[PDB]
């Protein structure tokens, strides 16, 4: 008789998504994120998932490993991977999108009390990330996903880096696509990323939330009005100059001064003088009481 291999008992990994059942619906945003239906039964009843893939393979693999081990109410859920060298990150899908799409469409529903509750949830997610010794480096309203009218989640970890044990910051090398208008002075000047640098980005995200992500009131729009919109390659040094002078984004319309003061504590020039996420949580909780 012909010799063959004994078949070992097959086990199913719920985090392993087969390419043949992962069916594309549409692009969500750009590296790119797509809405897919994982449909192993082929009858359009499968679960909708968000799929992150490459248009850098090493960076995607590191991102997958970070997200796989993060478990928090305000952090988007990892679901698994789809493997070819190629890899796709599979996450839960949030149909409301980010604060960038949701806030302009739901102003009537989202009052100051709800905005402060979203602010608390962003801080809780960020404080959990910091407790795991990570710096996010991309905290912006476009990366805050809306689970429901009552809950937001940090939804992308593409620039997330680990801070070495007993060290205070991570030094960046690849910075060409940096979101400079959300960056603290130490990031712009020395490419040094502290947990306090994410606190700075939070202050900017809080400004966006309070303006309902209005494009005319965006941090880029406002800073470009303050420094000049036609400076090209000179834009960042003009931005650094402005921040050194003590100039900050103005108080959002209808934002009470006590909320604006918490926001300004995120924007102290020196990282050591900035508020912590825990102190922000306490400040917002005192305003909600
Ligand atoms: C992990 C995840 C789960 N669920 C969603 N949902 C979702 C997202 C969006 N985008 C949010 C970011 N915007 C700049 C572009 C639109 C839109 C919809 S919708 C309203 O069209 O159904 C849904 N997106 C995810 N990630 C994702 C998608 C796109 C871009 C980024 C990076 O900012 C992260």
**28 annotated as belonging to a binding site for a ligand:** yes
Hey, which residues does 22 pair with through a beta bridge? Answer: 38
Q: Is 152 helix (H, G, I), strand (E, B) or coil?
A: strand
**Residue 249: burial class (beta carbons within 10 Å; 0-12, 13-18, 19+):** buried
Which positions ≥6 away from 57 have C-beta within 8 Å?
85, 86, 87
Resolution in angstroms comes to 1.8
**86 annotated as belonging to a binding site for a ligand:** no
Distance in angstroms (rounded) separating the CA atoms of residues 40 and 12: 13
Hey, which residues does 78 pair with through a beta bridge? Answer: 91
Q: Is 253 helix (H, G, I), strand (E, B) or coil?
A: coil
CA count, 13 A, side-chain hemisphere, 201: 27
CA count, 13 A, side-chain hemisphere, 15: 12
**240 annotated as belonging to a binding site for a ligand:** no
CB of 91 closer than 6 angstroms to any ligand 1 atom = yes
Which positions ≥6 away from 212 have C-beta within 8 Å?
103, 104, 107, 110
Please name the residue whose Cα sits nearest to atom 7 of ligand 1. 97
| Dihedral, CA of residue 272, residue 184, residue 216 and residue 160, to nearest 10 | -110
Alpha carbon distances (Å) from 163 to 98, 106, 132, 134, 202? 27, 37, 9, 6, 18
Displacement of CA 49 from its chain's centroid (Å)? 18
DSSP 8-state code for residue 181 = G
Question: Catalytic site residue 138?
Answer: yes
Distance in angstroms (rounded) separating the CA atoms of residues 221 and 216: 6
Mutation to probe ligand 1, out of 37, 51, 155 (largest number of atoms < 8 A from CB): 155
Alpha carbon distances (Å) from 283 to 106, 114, 123, 127, 258? 25, 15, 11, 15, 9
Hey, which residues does 146 pair with through a beta bridge? Answer: 152
Kind and range of the H or E run holding 147: strand 144-148
Catalytic position from the list 127, 138, 156, 198: 138
Task: Tell how far the Cα of 108 is from the centroid of ligand 1, in angstroms.
Answer: 22
Please name the residue whose Cα sits nearest to atom 8 of ligand 1. 97
Domains of the chain and CATH, by start: 10-93 (3.30.200.20), 94-289 (1.10.510.10)
Distance in angstroms (rounded) separating the CA atoms of residues 118 and 190: 31
Displacement of CA 50 from its chain's centroid (Å)? 15
Distance in angstroms (rounded) separating the CA atoms of residues 207 and 27: 28
Kind and range of the H or E run holding 286: helix 277-288
**Residue 236: burial class (beta carbons within 10 Å; 0-12, 13-18, 19+):** middle
**Residue 122: burial class (beta carbons within 10 Å; 0-12, 13-18, 19+):** buried
Task: Tell how far the Cα of 231 is from the centroid of ligand 1, in angstroms.
Answer: 31
Length of the chain: 289
Distance in angstroms (rounded) separating the CA atoms of residues 14 and 129: 25
Distance in angstroms (rounded) separating the CA atoms of residues 133 and 71: 14
User: 3-state secondary structure string, 40-87?
Assistant: CCCCCCCEEEEEEECCCHHHHHHHHHHHHCCCCCCECCEEEEEECCCE
Q: At CB < 8 A and 24+ separation, what contacts does 180-183 make?
A: 180/235, 180/236, 180/239, 181/219, 181/220, 181/223, 181/239, 182/138, 182/139, 182/140, 182/219
**Method by which this entry was solved:** X-ray
Please name the residue whose Cα sits nearest to atom 31 of ligand 1. 29
Task: Tell how far the Cα of 234 is from the centroid of ligand 1, in angstroms.
Answer: 32
Distance in angstroms (rounded) separating the CA atoms of residues 143 and 125: 12
- Residue pair 211/222 in contact by the 8 Å Cβ criterion: no
Question: Which atom of ligand 1 sits closest to the CA of residue 91?
Answer: 1
- Residue pair 81/15 in contact by the 8 Å Cβ criterion: yes
Question: Which atom of ligand 1 sits closest to the CA of residue 94?
Answer: 4
62 φ, ψ (degrees, to nearest 5): -65, -45
**52 annotated as belonging to a binding site for a ligand:** yes
Question: Which atom of ligand 1 sits closest to the CA of residue 95?
Answer: 22
Distance in angstroms (rounded) separating the CA atoms of residues 7 and 23: 30
């Amino acid at each position: 008789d012909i010799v063959s291999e004994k078949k070992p008992a097959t086990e199913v990994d719920p985090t392993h998504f087969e390419k043949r059942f992962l069916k594309r619906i549409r692009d969500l945003g750009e590296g790119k994120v797509e809405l897919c239906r994982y449909d192993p039964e082929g009858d359009n009843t499968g679960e909708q998932v968000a799929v992150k893939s490459l248009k850098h393979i090493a960076d995607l693999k590191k991102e997958i490993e970070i997200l796989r081990n993060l478990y928090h109410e305000n952090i988007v859920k990892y679901k698994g991977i789809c493997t070819e060298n190629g890899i796709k990150l599979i996450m839960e899908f949030l149909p409301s999108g980010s604060l960038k799409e949701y806030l302009p469409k739901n102003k009537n529903k989202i009052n100051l009390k709800q905005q402060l509750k979203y602010a608390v949830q962003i801080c809780k997610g960020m404080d959990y990330l910091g407790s795991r010794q990570y710096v996010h480096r991309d905290l912006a309203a476009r990366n805050v996903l809306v689970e429901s009218e009552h809950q937001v989640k940090i939804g992308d970890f593409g620039l997330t880096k680990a801070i070495e044990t007993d060290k205070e910051y991570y030094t960046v090398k690849d910075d060409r696509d940096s979101p400079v208008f959300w960056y603290a002075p130490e990031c712009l000047m020395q490419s040094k990323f502290y947990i306090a640098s994410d606190v700075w980005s939070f202050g900017v995200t809080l400004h966006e939330l309070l303006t309902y992500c209005d494009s005319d009131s965006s941090p880029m729009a406002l800073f470009l009005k303050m420094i000049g919109p036609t400076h090209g390659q000179m834009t960042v040094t003009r931005l650094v100059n402005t921040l050194k002078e003590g100039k900050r984004l103005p108080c959002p319309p209808n934002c009470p001064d006590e909320v604006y003061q918490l926001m300004r504590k995120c924007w102290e020039f020196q990282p050591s003088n900035r508020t912590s996420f825990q102190n922000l949580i306490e400040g917002f909780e005192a305003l909600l009481k």
